[PDB]
């Protein structure tokens, strides 16, 4: 005997996808809270943490939007002009 199962898809290196997420321009101060959010995942709070604070090292002490995608188990850092309704991935 046998049956179809149907399930959902799964994820992949191949394609790419972007995070997004608020919060305060340089914010140092911690308790060490991103240790078990990237425990799992491989990289270092400290690296990653880091960087985003030089980043916004201009900018320090402002709310601004940083887009962290993952790719390859490699971050990407960027600092967006302004925020708007952004949805539309195919041409035009």
């Known amino acids: 005997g046998s049956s179809g199962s149907s399930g959902p898809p799964k994820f992949d290196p191949n394609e790419v996808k ?3 997420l608020r919060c305060t321009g ?3 101060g911690a308790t060490s ?3 078990p959010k990237i425990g799992p995942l491989g990289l270092s709070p400290k690296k990653v943490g880091d960087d985003i604070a030089k980043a ?5 002490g402002l709310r601004i939007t940083v887009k962290l995608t993952i790719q390859n188990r490699q971050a990407q ?3 967006v002009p302004s925020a708007s309704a952004l949805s539309g991935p195919s041409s035009g």
């Open 26 to 28: 340089g914010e140092v």
């Open 33 to 35: 809270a991103l240790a």
């Open 18 to 20: 972007v995070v997004y």
């Open 77 to 79: 850092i960027e600092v």
């Open 56 to 60: 916004t090292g201009d900018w320090k």
